[PDB]
Amino acid sequence: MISLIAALAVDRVIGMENAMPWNLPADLAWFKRNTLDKPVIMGRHTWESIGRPLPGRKNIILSSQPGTDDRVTWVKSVDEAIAACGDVPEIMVIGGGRVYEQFLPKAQKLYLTHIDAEVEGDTHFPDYEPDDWESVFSEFHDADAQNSHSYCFEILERR
């Protein structure tokens, strides 16, 4: 099955190119715990934000352009990307925006981090109609010495 994981600010704004104005190590640990040992599919901007292959995961880059690197798999289409993953229980789609747009319709699960931050932004996580999704897990956390803002982890299941 296919899953989407993302960090959303107020109004569902997500990053486009520059790094988001927040510092949430708790959220990065959550991203890690949930994607480890799984293939991850991402767009070119996400690849640049990351800066190197995510370890312990199969890195698949979906893009209309040229693979600048031999350590990851570069695909030009969604079907190629899915194929690249092979036969696994869960495929993780890590963004950015267009990439989430493309896999949404095929997704069965969503791992979202809702962050209490108002950021001005162009892109938004695709519109998802909850009556179509079941919220099965939600856990809020306050900001602290290590996390710049309040955040709530949430898992949703496609009904």
Place this chain on the structure above:
Amino acid sequence: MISLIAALAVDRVIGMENAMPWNLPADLAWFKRNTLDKPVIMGRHTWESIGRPLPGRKNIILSSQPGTDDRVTWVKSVDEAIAACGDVPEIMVIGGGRVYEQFLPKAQKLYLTHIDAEVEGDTHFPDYEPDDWESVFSEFHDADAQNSHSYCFEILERR
């Protein structure tokens, strides 16, 4: 000599009730490059925020309270903190606010990172007179894929 190093948001804000709302790996790399192989003096709250000893530097904690950790050196006064540095050419003071206020009078150099971020702070860098310091290095950078805000590196020397 004694130097102070700090990251300042607009209005000299240096800390908030929670972690600062930004993600600036390049600033962190500049901090490391400038403190590596040097003794570092910090207050207890800064220490708590860090979590561990900074590798490759001698860590000195200035605080009225007793120890807590055996991997660093705990001191009770500024004189004590200085003496514990020994014979080194430059001592780095890394905050917070109170520590910076107390050591400014003896400092000859400032390594500052001005970050374009408007936040409500809790603590601020002490007020310094621009006429008393000479900027001998400055370098501006916009936010990018990995850094959330624009920032400018600056080194000032006491006139």
